[PDB]
Amino acid sequence: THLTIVTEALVPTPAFFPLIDKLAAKANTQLAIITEVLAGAWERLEQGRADIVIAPDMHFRSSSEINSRKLYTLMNVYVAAPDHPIHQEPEPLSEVTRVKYRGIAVADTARERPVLTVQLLDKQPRLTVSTIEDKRQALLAGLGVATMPYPMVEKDIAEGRLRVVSPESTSEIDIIMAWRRDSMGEAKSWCLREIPKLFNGK
Amino acid sequence: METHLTIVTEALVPTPAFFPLIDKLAAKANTQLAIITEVLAGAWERLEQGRADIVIAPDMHFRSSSEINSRKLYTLMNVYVAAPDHPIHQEPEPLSEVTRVKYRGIAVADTARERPVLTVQLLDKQPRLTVSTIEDKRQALLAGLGVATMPYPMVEKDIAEGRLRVVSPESTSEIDIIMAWRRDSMGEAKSWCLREIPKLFN
Numbered sequence A: 001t002h003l004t005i006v007t008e009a010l011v012p013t014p015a016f017f018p019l020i021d022k023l024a025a026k027a028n029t030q031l032a033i034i035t036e037v038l039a040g041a042w043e044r045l046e047q048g049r050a051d052i053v054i055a056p057d058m059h060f061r062s063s064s065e066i067n068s069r070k071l072y073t074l075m076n077v078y079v080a081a082p083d084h085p086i087h088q089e090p091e092p093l094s095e096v097t098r099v100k101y102r103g104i105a106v107a108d109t110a111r112e113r114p115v116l117t118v119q120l121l122d123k124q125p126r127l128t129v130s131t132i133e134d135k136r137q138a139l140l141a142g143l144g145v146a147t148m149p150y151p152m153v154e155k156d157i158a159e160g161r162l163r164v165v166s167p168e169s170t171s172e173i174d175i176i177m178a179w180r181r182d183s184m185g186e187a188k189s190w191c192l193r194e195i196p197k198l199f200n201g202k
Numbered sequence B: 001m002e003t004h005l006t007i008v009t010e011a012l013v014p015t016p017a018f019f020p021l022i023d024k025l026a027a028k029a030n031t032q033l034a035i036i037t038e039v040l041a042g043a044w045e046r047l048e049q050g051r052a053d054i055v056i057a058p059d060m061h062f063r064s065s066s067e068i069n070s071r072k073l074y075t076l077m078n079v080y081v082a083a084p085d086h087p088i089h090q091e092p093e094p095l096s097e098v099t100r101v102k103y104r105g106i107a108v109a110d111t112a113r114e115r116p117v118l119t120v121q122l123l124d125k126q127p128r129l130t131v132s133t134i135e136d137k138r139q140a141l142l143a144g145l146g147v148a149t150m151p152y153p154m155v156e157k158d159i160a161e162g163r164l165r166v167v168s169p170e171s172t173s174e175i176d177i178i179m180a181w182r183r184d185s186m187g188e189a190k191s192w193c194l195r196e197i198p199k200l201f202n
């Protein structure tokens, strides 16, 4: 009756919207598309509270009978407001410089899945937010410097609301679909074959 | 030496409204601010469990503990909305329980570790989409996927330019957004915020 899909914060939830009407005709399933951050997504899969997870490769979640499949590559870019002082700096990535300016991070579950944004060191000003929306607005308001998935800020860079601080730092991340094998129902199986079709060419 | 204050802004409350604090707080003390989003009961659970210094959330009509002091910030207007071409608009009595079951609700998952709430009426045998963030709920509504309440400020532009349409004014409700905190703990940064945040919504 109920399927839960977990789309990690980096993954746009509305990309999964086409499924909804199809899923309602396919089964009497009430859908939940739930957002989690980093380790939270895999914690949900371990605790049997999430049927399918769409999340970056994050080192753990290792359980009994867990399968995966790669969907697409996502580009993360270090960004900041155009008139943020970091842009006038000669060596923005120098440890001496980075500590001066405030990092922006998104909260997650109590680890269990060893990864960091690798965007902020210690003894350095930090703002923590729960959602990518808060993070984008904080960046737009010139309140700090942080990574962002390129698609969500492509328009912002185009119209000069944000500016990439240094392209060398930009990194690529695999977005993967994972699930557990021990239970494999009609709706869950159907989605497992349908979700990759959403990102053919991504 | 630095200092860490954690503020919870419930989903209905715009996190960027609290941005003015950040630069002031950094010059006032070495205080690192953390502005976390929770949903419904989740915000209050955080205050009870001593994991949140200040809570900005709707009045949840729960026995106001002595240990929680609260102060009203502003009134928020919630509007029952749907896409302009959603069938609900042609319906004579949209709010009738018989009618509401026909159409799909859109709900935001209560972040409570203890129990969720019946906020969305939890109409049984009724199609539902559940999402974690108010943005995803907005997009679901924009895509004409169902019917749900929304805080007017977030959708004001959408109603103006006819991307969303108020289904029935009778359903419109006003909610008090309140600031709550605990008496057992006080310090420089906490006290400073408690006096500064109300000025943001004078």
Ligand SMILES: Cc1cc(O)ccc1O
Pocket (backbone or CB within 6 Å): A009, A010, A011, A012, A013, A132, A149, A150, A151, A152
């Ligand atoms: C728009 C958007 C794009 C994306 O690639 C990830 C998250 C988002 O919210």
Ligand SMILES: Cc1cc(O)ccc1O
Pocket (backbone or CB within 6 Å): A012, A013, A014, A015, A151, B139
């Ligand atoms: C809203 C949305 C943003 C996006 O980048 C891809 C698909 C979407 O539905």
Ligand SMILES: Cc1cc(O)ccc1O
Pocket (backbone or CB within 6 Å): A009, A010, A037, A038, A076, A106, A116, A117, A147, A148, A149
């Ligand atoms: C690494 C990373 C994680 C995340 O949750 C959002 C953006 C990011 O760049």
Ligand SMILES: Cc1cc(O)ccc1O
Pocket (backbone or CB within 6 Å): B011, B012, B013, B014, B015, B134, B151, B153, B154
């Ligand atoms: C922008 C915004 C305004 C608001 O009044 C509530 C939530 C929001 O995300």
Ligand SMILES: Cc1cc(O)ccc1O
Pocket (backbone or CB within 6 Å): B014, B016, B017, B153, B154
């Ligand atoms: C940015 C912002 C949006 C809003 O809807 C209300 C207050 C605000 O400061």
Ligand SMILES: Cc1cc(O)ccc1O
Pocket (backbone or CB within 6 Å): B011, B012, B040, B058, B078, B107, B108, B119, B120, B149, B150
């Ligand atoms: C109506 C409503 C109120 C709320 O506080 C959170 C989500 C909601 O859908």
Ligand code: NA
Pocket (backbone or CB within 6 Å): A007, A009, A011, A012, A013, A014, A035, B133, B136
């Ligand atoms: Na999302």
Ligand code: NA
Pocket (backbone or CB within 6 Å): A130, A131, A134, B009, B010, B011, B013, B014, B015, B036, B037
């Ligand atoms: Na928020």
